[PDB]
Design a protein around this ligand. Structure first.
Ligand code: NAG
Ligand code: NAG
Ligand code: NAG
Ligand code: NAG
Ligand code: NAG
Lengths: 12, 577
């Protein structure tokens, strides 16, 4: 299954 | 020597979303010691590996990734004693990983990322003394990390992210002398980061986030120079950020968001001159932001929102000519907005809402050519919203509500080319709406409510894309313009709590989609046009506290809330006629 990478996508 | 390169008459057709073994298996019974590389990746194949692959005894390269292979791992591959790289990633292999990888003594690359494996990570692999890359991410692996994986000298890349591993992180892993890349987040690890990790002097990339970690951040990891990527977000770290972290001279990306960190951003952060991305969202941080962060030569992303920072924003922020997005919403910042934020025209997202910024919107912000989303409500910004925003070619979302803006409303808003949302509610303007506000091309939501507006509502010329209009709670006098049927996309209109006189515009009834209408607390007079009862789309029509007369319509008005009225008489559905 896929796994997230990179910084936190959270935004406003 | 793959895709039937050397015959090793017979087949060259390795395609056709067919299944392996038997479409395969002939490939192997061409016994041959001629075959050193076999690449069956992305052929849409499905199944098991045949026993007979053991006869490709000279194989060095085997890549079966990106198919639909299933069943448990085939230990026949462990008989390929010359195998040097093995790529099994993105398949459907399941069950506990079987023992016996040891016999692949010269194995240097093993990628099995994205599978269906369960059980414990194979302790057997700690015996591959030449291995350099190991990728077991993306399955359903359980248990702890085998402390013996720390004997994998030579190893420079390890990926185990995205399983259901847990326990404490094994201190012994810190002896992987040559490890450059460690990605092990998205698990359930608990406890702290072992301080022995401070010996991974070659480490460039360190994840382990969205786990269950806790404790103070270990001061010793300031020792990790060379490190460029440090992600530890979505954990439970408490305490303050080590001031030892100012020694990570190579760090480009830092992300501590979603923990419980306390105290201040260490002022040594002002020395991390390679920082590209600084993100500390959703912590308990406080104090002031070190001025030198506004001088970082390469900073592109600055996320500080949902903390409780005090003080002013660094005067020179943006002067590096590189800022792209900044978001410091939900803090206690004060002072003015720096003029340099968009130097370079790279800034496209500027988020400042829920602070206590003071002063005039800097006029430099009107020449920010790249600006796209601007959210600055709930502050103390005063003066005249400057003129020039309507000349930005990509500005689509603007929220300046709940501030202290006075005098007039910039007229160039109405000629902004792509502006889609504009609020401006709650502000103290004491002047008229701009004459050509409804002209605007794209502009779906406009909400200048409780902004001390005065005068008449301009004629609804054009009104191309509006679907929500909020002007409630001002002192708009005069008549509701009778050409409102130009607003064909309108869904919600609120003109309540004004000083509007006259009749209800009958052209409201040229309603393809109007759903919510609020005209209450005005001075309207006349009937509700009985044609309103034909609207198959009005669900709210609050018109109470007015001076209307006559019957209420029927049809699709017969099941509306009686409270929506409070003026005089109406169709049998209240006080008979
Ligand atoms: C396996 O094949 C893919 C492309 O199909 C390639 O990107 C990948 O690097 C290969 N694996 C190895 C270990 O070379
Ligand atoms: C940020 O605001 C959210 C609501 O928007 C609130 O739950 C949170 O506690 C706030 N945190 C800080 C540190 O300001
Ligand atoms: C944030 O800090 C200051 C006190 O110095 C004040 O704005 C407020 O009380 C604090 N907020 C929270 C949620 O503690
Ligand atoms: C506009 O801003 C006000 C106050 O800042 C807010 O309460 C309202 O929901 C906003 N309107 C829209 C349509 O977003
Ligand atoms: C209300 O409208 C009339 C239109 O003639 C105008 O004269 C009057 O000044 C308006 N009220 C204001 C601006 O407070």
């Amino acid at each position: 299954h896929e796994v997230p990478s990179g910084p936190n996508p959270i935004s406003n | 020597l793959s895709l039937k390169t050397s015959l090793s008459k017979v087949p060259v057709n390795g395609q056709n979303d067919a299944v392996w073994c038997s479409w395969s298996g002939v490939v192997c019974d061409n016994v041959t010691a001629q075959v050193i590389s076999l690449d069956l990746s992305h052929r849409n194949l499905s199944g098991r590996i045949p026993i007979q692959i053991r006869y490709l005894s000279s194989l060095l390269y085997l890549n079966l990734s990106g198919n639909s292979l299933e069943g448990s791992f085939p230990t026949s591959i462990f008989d390929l004693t010359k195998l040097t790289t093995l790529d099994i990633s993105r398949n459907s292999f399941d069950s506990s990983f079987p023992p016996g990888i040891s016999k692949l003594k010269f194995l240097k690359v093993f990628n099995a990322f994205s599978n269906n494996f369960e059980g414990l990570l194979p302790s057997d692999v700690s015996r591959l003394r030449f291995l350099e890359e190991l990728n077991f991410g993306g399955s359903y692996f359980e248990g702890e990390i085998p402390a013996a994986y720390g004997g994998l000298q030579r190893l420079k890349f390890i990926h185990l992210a995205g399983n259901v591993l847990g326990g404490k992180l094994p201190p012994r892993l810190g002896l992987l002398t040559e490890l450059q890349h460690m990605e092990i987040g998205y698990n359930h690890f608990n406890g702290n980061i072992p301080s022995e990790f401070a010996l991974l002097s070659n480490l460039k990339y360190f994840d382990v986030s969205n786990c269950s970690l806790s404790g103070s951040l270990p001061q010793e990891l300031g020792n990790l120079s060379n490190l460029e990527t440090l992600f530890l977000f979505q954990n439970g770290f408490t305490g303050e950020i080590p001031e030892s972290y100012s020694n990570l001279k190579s760090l480009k990306l830092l992300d501590f968001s979603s923990n419980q960190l306390s105290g201040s951003i260490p002022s040594g952060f002002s020395t991390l001159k390679n920082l590209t991305w600084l993100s500390l969202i959703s912590n308990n941080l406080s104090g002031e932001v070190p001025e030198g962060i506004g001088e970082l030569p390469e900073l592109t992303t600055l996320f500080l929102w949902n903390n409780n920072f005090t003080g002013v924003l660094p005067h020179k922020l943006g002067s590096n000519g590189k800022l792209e997005t900044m978001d410091v919403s939900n803090n206690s910042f004060t002072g003015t907005i720096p003029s340099s934020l968009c130097h370079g025209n790279k800034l496209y997202k500027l988020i400042l809402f829920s602070n206590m910024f003071e002063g005039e919107l800097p006029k430099s912000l009107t020449r920010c050519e790249s600006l796209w989303r601007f959210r600055s409500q709930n502050n103390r910004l005063n003066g005249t919203i400057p003129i020039g925003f309507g000349s930005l070619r990509n500005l689509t979302f603007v929220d300046l509500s709940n501030n202290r803006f006075t005098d007039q409303i910039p007229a160039d808003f109405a000629t902004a080319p792509v502006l889609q949302y504009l609020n401006l509610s709650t502000n103290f303007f004491h002047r008229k709406l701009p004459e050509n506000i409804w002209k605007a091309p794209n502009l779906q939501i406009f909400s200048a409510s409780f902004s001390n507006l005065i005068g008449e509502i301009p004629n609804y010329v054009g009104c191309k894309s509006f679907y929500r209009i909020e002007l409630q709670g001002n002192s708009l006098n005069g008549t509701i313009p009778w050409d409102i049927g130009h607003c064909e996309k309108l869904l919600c209109l609120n003109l309540s709590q004004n000083h509007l006189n006259g009749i209800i515009p009958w052209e409201i009834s040229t309603l393809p989609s109007i759903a919510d209408v609020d005209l209450s607390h005005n001075l309207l007079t006349g009937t509700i046009p009985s044609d309103f009862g034909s609207s198959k789309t009005i669900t709210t029509f609050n018109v109470s506290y007015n001076q209307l007369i006559g019957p209420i319509p029927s049809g699709s008005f017969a099941h509306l809330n009686p409270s929506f009225f409070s003026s005089n008489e109406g169709l049998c559905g209240d006080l008979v006629g």
